[PDB]
Amino acid sequence: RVLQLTLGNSTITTQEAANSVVAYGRWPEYLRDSPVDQPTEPDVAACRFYTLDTVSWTKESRGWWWKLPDALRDMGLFGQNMYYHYLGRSGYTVHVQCNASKFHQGALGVFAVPEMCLAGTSYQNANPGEKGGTFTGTFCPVDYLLGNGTLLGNAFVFPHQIINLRTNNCATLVLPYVNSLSIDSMVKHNNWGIAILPLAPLNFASESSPEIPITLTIAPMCCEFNGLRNITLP
Amino acid sequence: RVLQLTLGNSTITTQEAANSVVAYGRWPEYLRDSPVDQPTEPDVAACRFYTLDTVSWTKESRGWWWKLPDALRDMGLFGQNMYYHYLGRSGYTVHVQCNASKFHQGALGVFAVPEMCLAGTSYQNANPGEKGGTFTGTFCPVDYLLGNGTLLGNAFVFPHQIINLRTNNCATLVLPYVNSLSIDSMVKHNNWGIAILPLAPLNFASESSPEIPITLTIAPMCCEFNGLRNITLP
Amino acid sequence: XXXXXXXXXXXXXXXXXXXXXXCXXXXXXXXXXXXXXXXXXXXXXXXXXXXXXXXXXXXXXXXXXXXXXXXXXXXXXXXXXXXXXXXXXXXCXXXXXXXXXXXXXXXXXXXXXXXXXXXXXXXXXXXXXXXXXXXXXXCXXXXXXXXXXXXXXXXXXXXXXXXXXXXXXXXXXXXXXXXXXXXXXXXXXXXXXXXXXXCXXXXXXXXXXXXXXXXXXXCXXXXXXXXXXXXXXXXXXXXXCXXXXXXXXXXXXXXXXXXXXXXXXXXXXXXXXXXXXXXXXXXXXXXXXXXXXXXXXXXXXXXXXXXXXXXXXXCXXXXXXXXXXXXXXXXXXXXXXXXXXXXXXXXXXXXXXXXXXXXXXXCXXXXXXXXXXXXXXXXXXXXXXXXXXXXXXXXXXXXXXXXXXXXXXXXXXXXXXXCXXXXXXXXXXXXXXXXXXXC
Amino acid sequence: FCGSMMATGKLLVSYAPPGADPPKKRKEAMLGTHVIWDIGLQSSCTMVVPWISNTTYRQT
Numbered sequence: 001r002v003l004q005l006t007l008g009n010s011t012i013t014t015q016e017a018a019n020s021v022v023a024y025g026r027w028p029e030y031l032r033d034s035p036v037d038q039p040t041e042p043d044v045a046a047c048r049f050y051t052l053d054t055v056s057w058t059k060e061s062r063g064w065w066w067k068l069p070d071a072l073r074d075m076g077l078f079g080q081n082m083y084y085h086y087l088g089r090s091g092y093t094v095h096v097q098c099n100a101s102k103f104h105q106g107a108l109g110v111f112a113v114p115e116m117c118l119a120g121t122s123y124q125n126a127n128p129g130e131k132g133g134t135f136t137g138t139f140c141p142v143d144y145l146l147g148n149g150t151l152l153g154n155a156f157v158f159p160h161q162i163i164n165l166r167t168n169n170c171a172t173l174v175l176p177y178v179n180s181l182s183i184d185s186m187v188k189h190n191n192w193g194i195a196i197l198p199l200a201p202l203n204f205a206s207e208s209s210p211e212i213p214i215t216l217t218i219a220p221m222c223c224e225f226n227g228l229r230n231i232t233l234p
Numbered sequence: 235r236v237l238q239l240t241l242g243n244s245t246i247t248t249q250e251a252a253n254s255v256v257a258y259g260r261w262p263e264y265l266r267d268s269p270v271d272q273p274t275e276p277d278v279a280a281c282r283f284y285t286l287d288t289v290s291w292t293k294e295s296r297g298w299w300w301k302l303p304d305a306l307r308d309m310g311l312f313g314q315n316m317y318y319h320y321l322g323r324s325g326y327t328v329h330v331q332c333n334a335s336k337f338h339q340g341a342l343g344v345f346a347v348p349e350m351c352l353a354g355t356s357y358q359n360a361n362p363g364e365k366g367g368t369f370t371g372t373f374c375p376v377d378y379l380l381g382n383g384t385l386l387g388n389a390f391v392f393p394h395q396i397i398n399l400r401t402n403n404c405a406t407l408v409l410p411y412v413n414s415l416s417i418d419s420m421v422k423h424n425n426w427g428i429a430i431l432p433l434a435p436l437n438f439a440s441e442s443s444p445e446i447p448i449t450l451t452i453a454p455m456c457c458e459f460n461g462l463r464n465i466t467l468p
Numbered sequence: 469x470x471x472x473x474x475x476x477x478x479x480x481x482x483x484x485x486x487x488x489x490x491c492x493x494x495x496x497x498x499x500x501x502x503x504x505x506x507x508x509x510x511x512x513x514x515x516x517x518x519x520x521x522x523x524x525x526x527x528x529x530x531x532x533x534x535x536x537x538x539x540x541x542x543x544x545x546x547x548x549x550x551x552x553x554x555x556x557x558x559x560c561x562x563x564x565x566x567x568x569x570x571x572x573x574x575x576x577x578x579x580x581x582x583x584x585x586x587x588x589x590x591x592x593x594x595x596x597x598x599x600x601x602x603x604x605x606x607c608x609x610x611x612x613x614x615x616x617x618x619x620x621x622x623x624x625x626x627x628x629x630x631x632x633x634x635x636x637x638x639x640x641x642x643x644x645x646x647x648x649x650x651x652x653x654x655x656x657x658x659x660x661x662x663x664x665x666x667c668x669x670x671x672x673x674x675x676x677x678x679x680x681x682x683x684x685x686x687c688x689x690x691x692x693x694x695x696x697x698x699x700x701x702x703x704x705x706x707x708x709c710x711x712x713x714x715x716x717x718x719x720x721x722x723x724x725x726x727x728x729x730x731x732x733x734x735x736x737x738x739x740x741x742x743x744x745x746x747x748x749x750x751x752x753x754x755x756x757x758x759x760x761x762x763x764x765x766x767x768x769x770x771x772x773x774x775x776x777x778x779x780x781x782x783c784x785x786x787x788x789x790x791x792x793x794x795x796x797x798x799x800x801x802x803x804x805x806x807x808x809x810x811x812x813x814x815x816x817x818x819x820x821x822x823x824x825x826x827x828x829x830x831c832x833x834x835x836x837x838x839x840x841x842x843x844x845x846x847x848x849x850x851x852x853x854x855x856x857x858x859x860x861x862x863x864x865x866x867x868x869x870x871x872x873x874x875x876x877x878x879x880x881x882x883x884x885x886x887c888x889x890x891x892x893x894x895x896x897x898x899x900x901x902x903x904x905x906x907c
Numbered sequence: 908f909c910g911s912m913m914a915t916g917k918l919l920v921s922y923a924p925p926g927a928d929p930p931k932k933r934k935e936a937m938l939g940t941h942v943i944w945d946i947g948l949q950s951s952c953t954m955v956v957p958w959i960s961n962t963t964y965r966q967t
Binding site: 272320321415416417418419460461462463464465466467 | 922924925926927939940942953954955956957958959961962963
Binding site: 009012050053076097100101 | 916917934937946949
């Protein structure tokens with residue numbers, strides 16, 4: 001069975017979004033009552049599954065990472081909205097599938113990390129846009145650290161899902177908007193940050209594709225923006 | 235008394251739109267029933283009063299003219315819509331005021347002309363964009379002809395209104411969409427064309443502004459576009 | 469980033485024929501409506517001129533003959549009238565107005581005409597030069613419709629070896645001709661010991677080899693940039709970008725680098741509208757182009773100067789496609805050499821240098837570092853039929869050109885010409901005349 | 908698709924509507940309308956392109 005999800009001009013097929021995890025079990029929604037609260041609401045075409053360029057997981061692949069909204073600082077509309085607008089706030093459904101054959105043992109951890117400050121500093125350095133940033137096992141923040149001198153084994157606190165190949169081959173984190181504010185400048189501040197690390201090292205059979213692809217399908221949800229609308233009076 | 239008309243981010247003050255004329259007494263509206271008819275409906279921000287650069291009417295001014303939609307081939311949004319879209323159709327309220335002092339005798343005729351083929355040939359030649367095109371009294375199509383070797387005196391057939399200065403100083407034509415089709419390529423085909431000619435020659439008192447300004451405030455109404463939306467099926 | 473690969477770099481189209489300059493872009497050169505390609509025709513030692521834009525329409529300062537084509541990646545140029553002024557390098561772009569340019573190397577279109585003979589005009593050495601022990605035997609090879617213009621200097625009935633440095637000039641736009649002024653420099657004792665120092669020129673004009681032997685006994689928008697700048701290794705090298713209008717362009721004060729042995733390339737486009745700029749990916753850490761909000765001026769500075777970053781920077785503040793703009797192209801050099809004043813040596817026009825209807829009476833501005841030797845005539849008064857030769861490069865990193873101003877044989881007593889050899893580098897003014905010798 | 912039963916991948920099929928230009932990069936095409944058809948899940952992507960024309964009868 002395969003569900004075919006649609007968001008206007010975009011469509012994604014999904015085996016079974018049974019293993020969907022909403023971070024902190026909070027579904028993303030708009031700003032509740034708590035016009036005057038300037039909720040410019042363009043939930044039309046900026047809410048379509050976008051697809052980042054796939055990375056090629058290999059034997060010695062350390063890991064990948066993308067900041068959000070950053071990633072979509074170009075995905076057409078949404079990327080636009082993050083300029084004609086000063087303020088905004090979107091949740092996001094991140095949908096990571098990585099099709100592989102039944103002969104590829106391996107396992108990835110997808111970690112959504114609120115305010116993912118990757119340590120070891122210059123805007124561009126920490127914003128790899130749409131191609132994401134990679135880790136290293138010794139610029140590239142240390143993998144088993146996630147920049148921040150932490151022991152990997154604890155990552156699992158952060159909304160996470162494990163793509164153990166000999167089972168599900170997809171994963172879907174659902175991040176809701178999270179921040180110390182109620183709305184904010186979507187451009188200069190990346191609420192989330194998705195890191196994908198290989199837990200079990202990718203291994204396969206003799207003559208088989210030695211580099212399985214993994215795609216990210218980030219769809220901004222219930223997004224909104226500030227206001228330019230002023231007011232007049234007679 | 236002065237009415238203050240609003241269309242989102244734009245606002246126009248108008249003395250009294252009492253002398254408003256709808257061409258052929260047909261108000262512009264959308265495509266009636268006569269989704270399947272692919273009526274992509276973005277009647278949001280493309281429907282705001284735009285304002286063309288004012289022309290300076292003088293003694294020896296012959297006349298001016300603008301093709302529509304052409305004119306708005308740049309007025310932000312609407313101009314955009316005429317590219318991301320293949321098909322479209324908009325009416326328009328054209329609102330021509332020309333503030334002058336009580337000491338300026340003069341009179342203009344505003345003529346809306348469906349399919350205004352200005353004769354004497356190269357796209358750019360017949361599409362002066364937003365600054366409009368001017369006439370001449372002998373490139374510049376002959377004024378008392380409107381290109382087409384016609385006698386001026388008959389213009390009045392075409393939806394028209396006369397700005398006789400010693401009376402109303404504004405004029406508002408309301409064109410509805412007109413064409414041999416039901417929808418069309420807004421870009422390569424100018425449904426209307428507004429020509430403003432001075433009937434009574436502009437004259438004034440000794441030391442007074444010798445060049446009264448006339449502004450055009452074209453607001454596209456009930457506009458719509460073709461479709462990119464395809465369809466899938468299991 | 470739509471590219472371009474201008475094939476057929478070398479092409480010689482004579483007058484009366486039809487030239488061409490094809491384009492082959494890797495990516496499309498049109499998206500919205502019109503094309504982003506174009507047809508250019510830039511001569512040697514010039515700025516970013518306006519020939520064509522949008523691949524269909526024509527730019528300001530051009531004729532109607534130059535047509536348009538290439539509504540895609542595969543574009544080309546058009547010319548229905550070839551001449552001597554048609555000699556200009558053509559390079560199709562892939563941008564209309566946006567600040568994202570990346571053009572190809574170049575597809576030059578040379579000109580030709582009926583072959584002519586190259587007369588030998590050998591002059592004697594100056595006195596002020598000979599005193600210093602810089603006796604050089606000059607020989608001009610101008611007024612010839614052939615590229616190959618050799619000048620082999622002799623000494624005591626034997627051709628010299630490792631004692632000459634000739635320099636050929638550009639293609640004169642008069643009747644498709646060229647020039648070449650060579651000089652055989654030697655020591656004082658060397659020139660004194662030698663009886664005669666002849667020089668032959670066997671070009672593709674005459675049957676035999678002609679020479680001239682003489683005994684060494686008796687005989688919309690604009691932007692005026694600054695001049696060239698001199699600096700050392702690991703120093704500063706910027707360029708002035710000031711306009712003579714209200715302000716700059718809408719998009720931004722774009723720049724196009726022009727280094728030695730290259731056509732054109734985009735580096736970075738800095739705006740003078742507000743503050744934001746936009747550069748290319750390749751150039752990084754050496755395109756510090758800012759904006760001066762004082763008198764409507766821009767900048768084109770580059771830190772950590774290298775041999776590569778050393779290029780003539782300017783700004784072509786073009787708003788529309790037809791009415792464009794360019795700069796003076798203020799050269800920014802980076803080498804290790806001391807500056808020196810250009811001393812002008814007077815070379816008299818003898819009967820040997822005379823061709824029965826001419827008398828080459830010019831000067832010699834040798835021993836001048838930081839190449840800047842422009843030899844004018846009577847403080848830049850008359851300049852017709854004369855062409856400026858290219859400066860040669862020495863091992864020491866100096867420059868010594870040879871400018872020969874043609875004159876009348878009879879007119880060598882009444883009037884007198886003075887060639888002002890200026891040098892802004894060393895800032896030494898000098899204007900030596902050229903009197904006639906009896907011999 | 909009519910390749911291995913074990914083979915697997917994802918192809919993006921995109922409908923560039925008329926007037927525009929066919930997309931040349933996958934990216935541009937993902938911005939447009941487009942199915943992301945997983946080889947491995949369904950051996951066949953179907954998709955009805957829609958009817959359009961100003962001149963409400965296309966000329967052959």
